Amino acid sequence: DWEQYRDRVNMLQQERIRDSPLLQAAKENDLRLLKILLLNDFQQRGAVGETALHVAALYDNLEAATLLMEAAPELAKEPALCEPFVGQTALHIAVMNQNLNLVRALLARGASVSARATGAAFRRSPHNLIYYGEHPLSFAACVGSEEIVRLLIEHGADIRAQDSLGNTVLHILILQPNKTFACQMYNLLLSYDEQSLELVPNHQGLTPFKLAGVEGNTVMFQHLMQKRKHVQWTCGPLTSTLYDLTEIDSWGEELSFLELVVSSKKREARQILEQTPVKELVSFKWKKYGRPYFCVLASLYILYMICFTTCCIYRPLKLRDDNRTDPRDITILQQKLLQEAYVTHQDNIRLVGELVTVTGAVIILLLEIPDIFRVGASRYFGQTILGGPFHVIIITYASLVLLTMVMRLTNMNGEVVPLSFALVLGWCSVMYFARGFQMLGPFTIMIQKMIFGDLMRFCWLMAVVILGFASAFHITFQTEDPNNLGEFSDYPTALFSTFELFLTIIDGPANYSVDLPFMYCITYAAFAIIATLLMLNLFIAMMGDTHWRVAQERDELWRAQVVATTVMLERKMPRFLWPRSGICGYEYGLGDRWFLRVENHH
Amino acid sequence: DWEQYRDRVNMLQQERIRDSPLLQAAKENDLRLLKILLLNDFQQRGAVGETALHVAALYDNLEAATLLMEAAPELAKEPALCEPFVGQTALHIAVMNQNLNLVRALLARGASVSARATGAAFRRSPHNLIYYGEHPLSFAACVGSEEIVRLLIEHGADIRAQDSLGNTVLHILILQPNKTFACQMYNLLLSYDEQSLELVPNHQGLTPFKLAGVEGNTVMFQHLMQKRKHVQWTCGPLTSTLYDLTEIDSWGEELSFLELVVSSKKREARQILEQTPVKELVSFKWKKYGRPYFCVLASLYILYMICFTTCCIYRPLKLRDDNRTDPRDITILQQKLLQEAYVTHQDNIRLVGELVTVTGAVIILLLEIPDIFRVGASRYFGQTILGGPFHVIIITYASLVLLTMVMRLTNMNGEVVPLSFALVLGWCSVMYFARGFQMLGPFTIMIQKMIFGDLMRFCWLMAVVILGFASAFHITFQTEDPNNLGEFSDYPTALFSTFELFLTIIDGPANYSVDLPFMYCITYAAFAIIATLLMLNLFIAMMGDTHWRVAQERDELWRAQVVATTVMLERKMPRFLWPRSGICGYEYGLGDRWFLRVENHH
Ligand SMILES: CC(C)[C@@H](C)/C=C/[C@@H](C)[C@H]1CC[C@H]2C3=CC=C4C[C@@H](O)CC[C@]4(C)[C@H]3CC[C@]12C
Ligand SMILES: CC(C)[C@@H](C)/C=C/[C@@H](C)[C@H]1CC[C@H]2C3=CC=C4C[C@@H](O)CC[C@]4(C)[C@H]3CC[C@]12C
Ligand SMILES: CC(C)[C@@H](C)/C=C/[C@@H](C)[C@H]1CC[C@H]2C3=CC=C4C[C@@H](O)CC[C@]4(C)[C@H]3CC[C@]12C
Ligand SMILES: CC(C)[C@@H](C)/C=C/[C@@H](C)[C@H]1CC[C@H]2C3=CC=C4C[C@@H](O)CC[C@]4(C)[C@H]3CC[C@]12C
């Protein structure tokens, strides 16, 4: 809807301009028409509450604008009035258009340096092609005009002014597309900070440094670190550099810089983890504490999955309580009742295995469920870097184990169902620990990108081929004796047999002792060419093409998963297992700060 | 044939020139021979009716040509006479050769600016390496000569002159290979238009704008739009531009610009759909109306295919009316007659499912058959972008359902045959709707390019291996008892078993309880190495290589299929479901035209 509305607003602005000789003269730069018309209403408006001076500024007409102020100087103070552009002044427009002389002329008339363009055209949104904040200084910074940024601070513009998101100009600058002035402009604006402006948080709680991390602005991140590094010594090709970890390690805060970076929705935030002080810090944390503890947690989880598997294998079963009648029934055994199920030393050993099994399902829920709420369910389940799909299946596993325990307590039949799903998802969730090892981590990401990519696309077109051919095979065999060829004997079996025949995992139905219907040979030749020969090998060809084009994305995602594991372990484990990282400054007279020392060759 | 004929014409032209001292002097530029020979027939002809002045112009000899006119000025007016070059003048030739002084000399003698070179050498065809139209002005435009184009219009050449295709010079220019003058030359020729010349249609009904769309000339399309855009405002990096949709949306016309573009045979016409106003218009139409309605039509078609499938599953069958005799017969059931087939509430429910099934087959034919005639059967079935092969199978489906209904009404046996083909093609045609979704559309094009590409090439060489080895296996087993190994028991079964063994979809024939002929082990080892190991994996290797080299073509074809779906839906659906797209100019005083407003960052 918003596009058609904005489109109408734009048409309606031009309609009023074209309808009004003052606004047309201001757009056209018709000095002669202004020199007639201004002598005989100056406060008349375009469709959004824009004045003739907004029009003159928009069409970049200094000559018209100086006439309009000479006739009616109060126009320099006027905001626009309607929701798209409300609060916008001719000063915001003169800054957008980089017209230094028109800006200085509006300031000479006393246009407000602190006016907020609060309308919907100025809010960070997918609707807007730019986000310059709401103040003339924020615009002057985002257009890169050093002259206008100085001229506005000379006229009393406040560098610490915040917009409707709480963004100061330093936050607005870090949100810009990477262009050469943006770091120059940040370094200029901090020269007027003489708490510091770069410590002011927005309404998300982000300081400009954390915003650079979340937004993936690696150029601004390196610029921010030039003032947090100290070059300790240089000797020949070697230098020792000491980096202040205060902002990076984010000590004692609920949401850390590293957590905000790994949990960011933006693709570019992974590149912050490859920036020098960050890369060495998370590397140290991983090789020192993270990998050792993750290998222990993997071992404990594998041992727990062996315990659960043993409790499935030794599950309590007795010879069935009724006779089998029809030859098609093969069930011979049956679930024991509670007071039959715990009557031997072997059951008492299985019972402690069941209690360990249930205890671990509770511990999974106690560890997982609080992090759904903190992170938000969309990010907690939806992020490859955090382990999103492994969170879905490990909670499903714990839910199915607790379902199995309430079924057991109730003497409820069919425990084999939740136990089978629990064994599959229980064991498949061991692949969460693949992320700890360079052999297996990148490959586990590649399997994930194949499942949510080429597998769903293949399975939709495969389902349509299966519905076609299974129906053809079923009705081809409906005339025939099902005991002579069973694969297509009823429609559910025909679907299942056709699915197995698509994958070639059962042999092509054959009985050379009998005359099969001629339409089967035809239909199977068409199915063998389309499903088996073409489609299944085209799935190989498709994944082969996807693999080489995904290979770098897979490796970046793996380096990000190691960091997200490191961050998660340190936040969740007891603090005595995670000593504070880097060098304590207090031992060396550097005050309360902590450092990373990096030595490098150049 | 035409090459050998033209070749003879060219040899015969040179033969006459070499035979005739006047024409040889005109080619050679032998001024001294002309200064002897011209004093004592000047109207004598080369093999195609060319004069000595045509020869002098062709060999680019101004000196000879001014002598020939000094002796016989009527030569400037002479056309060539024979079918290859009929109507060609020395003025057409002097323009081809860009000889401004020779052109101005022929015009001083009163050579016709409006002569038509109507012969076969000048017609748009695959025989001709250039198409410059038929008039000297059309040639002057296509050689890019601004001096000669001005000099010809100064001498009264008509810019609106049309050739045998109805092409004006603006159409001829849009047909040229993209070279720097072609837009300059179009912009020059419109400066003499002061209805407009760019509204004149050719004999296909195409104006120059629609011809640029059909021909895929994206450079001329962008040039044409520079005069249909209005830049509404510019502010900082943003601009709002208003594009006139009149030619693009082609409102109320039988064949629209967008339909002519998507239905074009030329590969380059897809690139027009990625040009700014077109791209935003078809995108709006798709996201606003096309995708919603296509998802409904997909749902209704899937529900219809479920209804038909249910009518196949519940088809009316009774226990056979005769005893089975030989053990090889497995048929136990049989088709019911009409007065047996509709006798229960379950049959009455199936009957309304059959009536819905038949009604939908009629509705498919009522929707499809008129579009065969309008589009032409070669384009309607032959285009990947329009859905050509899906039109073939969906009409085959409807034909087989109506065949099945006339069989049913006749009590005709073997309904299983058209029903099986109808189930396969009925369900496979659901993949037509894959084009609506980015997950499935590109992949459905890739399956199509594999079927008509690497699959036919593999299936021809596979058939030759199957004929070889099936014959070897059959005659190897002819000596042996068919009840001990059935796969090769007769030649049709040997072919079918060999085809299934090629694909590995049945197991290698084995019976370890008996002595198989030694020639079987040899022949199967050769078949396993050639068919299974080599050829079938070479099919995987081949499609893998085809896939990466086709991947971009596949994605362009998908973006074109979304537009062709959008265009088709809007033309076929009721108009109240497709409100006219863009902005009505009449609300804003812009007259009867409709616009797209585009906002962009630069
Ligand atoms: C029990 C059966 C009947 C069915 C219901 C179970 C589904 C299993 C096989 C499927 C469901 C989702 C799948 C799945 C989800 C996502 C990932 C993350 C990826 O990086 C590695 C593979 C992995 C871990 C796979 C493993 C197989 C799973 C767990
Ligand atoms: C990869 C995609 C295509 C997935 C969705 C495919 C699913 C189809 C082919 C498979 C998946 C589960 C299969 C399935 C589940 C269980 C049963 C019960 C069995 O006694 C009869 C067959 C029946 C009913 C089959 C029918 C075919 C199904 C539904
Ligand atoms: C019923 C059997 C015996 C035989 C005769 C039928 C043939 C089927 C299997 C074949 C014939 C042509 C094939 C075909 C034609 C072209 C296309 C377009 C492509 O983009 C997707 C696949 C698709 C839709 C395939 C699907 C499988 C089809 C429909
Ligand atoms: C992919 C290409 C090679 C295609 C054309 C291959 C076709 C051959 C191998 C297959 C397609 C259909 C098959 C086929 C159709 C139906 C029957 C009836 C059956 O009772 C005996 C075998 C017989 C006669 C087989 C013989 C082998 C055929 C003709």
Numbering used by the authors:
A (entry chain B), B (entry chain A): 28 to 67, 71 to 224, 230 to 637
Reproduce passages from the article:
Transient receptor potential vanilloid (TRPV) channels are a group of six polymodal cation channels subdivided into two subgroups by their sequence identity and functional properties. TRPV1–TRPV4 comprise the first subgroup of non-selective Ca2+ channels, TRPV5 and TRPV6 constitute the second subgroup of Ca2+ selective channels. TRPV channels are blocked by ruthenium red (RR), a universal pore blocker for a wide array of cation channels. Here we use cryo-electron microscopy to reveal the molecular details of RR block in TRPV2 and TRPV5, members of the two TRPV subfamilies.
Next, we prepared cryo-EM grids of wild-type rabbit TRPV5 reconstituted into nanodiscs treated first with 400 μM PI(4,5)P2 for 5–10 min and then 1 mM RR for 45 min before preparing grids. This dataset yielded a single stable state: TRPV5PIP2+RR with C4 symmetry at 2.65 Å resolution. TRPV5PIP2+RR contained strong extra density at the TRPV5 SF consistent with the size and shape of RR, but did not show the expected density for PI(4,5)P2. The RR molecule in TRPV5PIP2+RR remains coordinated at Site 2, with the Thr539 backbone carbonyl and sidechain hydroxyl forming hydrogen bonds (3.1–3.2 Å) with ammonia groups of the top ruthenium atom. The bottom of the RR molecule now occupies Site 3, which allows for the formation of hydrogen bonds with Asn572 (2.9 Å). TRPV5PIP2+RR also has density coordinated at Asp542 which is significantly separated from the RR density and is likely caused by the coordination of an ion at this position. Conversely, the addition of RR to PI(4,5)P2-activated TRPV5 caused the channel to close and take on a conformation identical to TRPV5Apo. No density in the TRPV5PIP2+RR map was observed for the PI(4,5)P2 molecule, likely because the channel is closed. Based on our data, we propose that RR interaction with Asn572 at Site 3 may pull the S6 helix towards the central axis of the pore and closes the lower gate at Ile575. This closure would draw the key Arg584 residue away from the PI(4,5)P2 binding site, leading to the observed loss of PI(4,5)P2 binding.
